[PDB]
Amino acid sequence: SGAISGDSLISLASTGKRVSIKDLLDEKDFEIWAINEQTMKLESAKVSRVFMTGKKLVYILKTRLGRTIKATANHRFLTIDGWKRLDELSLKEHIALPRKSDISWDSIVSITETGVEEVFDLTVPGPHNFVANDIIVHASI
Amino acid sequence: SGAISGDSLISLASTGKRVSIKDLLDEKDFEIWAINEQTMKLESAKVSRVFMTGKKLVYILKTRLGRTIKATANHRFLTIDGWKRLDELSLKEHIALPRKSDISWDSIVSITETGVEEVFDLTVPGPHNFVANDIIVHASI
């Protein structure tokens, strides 16, 4: 149920390349990087499908390291105490970023509403999350 | 225990004038606007003293109306369910702004760390809060 800006760069596990999620709309069955929540280790995982969900108000989330992403109020990020909607995060939270133990829990330094844009998501069977703009984000539903 | 940037403009109840809290450091016993939490009505209240608390990292909080203020991570604002530290606020919260029923509960649209600056507070016996940059904020201790 979330969605992120089409500008967001998706990390491709088999290569180390990044291509915007907008540019991946007509693509499927490629691997992305997901965190396995039970083990807290990153693992390659297949993307079932990519899709746009329409135009939605988006918000810039920025971490102390400088990682940033634009996303809907309801898109979820991985917090020390679980998945939380962007609109539920506060500056006291830390969120999961891929490090290369497998992850860094970085402080949020900014959350600001920016504007409406075309927004996208993807489905990832099993772990249900992926790395975009070098930040761990939840996938479809 | 909070504190806000010296740039913050303090609403003077007897006149309707605004002067930065930095500019009020050597001033006392003037009235400011405070909310009476039991009644939720604004009332004039005396400022006992104004003081700088040193240099501290500050954060810009902005509301949907466009009201904005720079304040420490621990400075409190009035939420629909009580006083909350800036670092505990999320975009789903609304905070109290003086309206002229007596107050408007406006959505937060931005919270972003900005930099270190000299920071100030003031003491207000009884209601313990005041209006700065047209936003209700908690006073000393």
Swiss-Prot record, chains A, B:
Intrachain disulfide bonds: none
Q: Which domain of life is it from?
A: Bacteria
* Stated name of the protein: Ssp DnaB intein
Q: Which residues of the full protein are shown?
A: 379 to 811 of 872
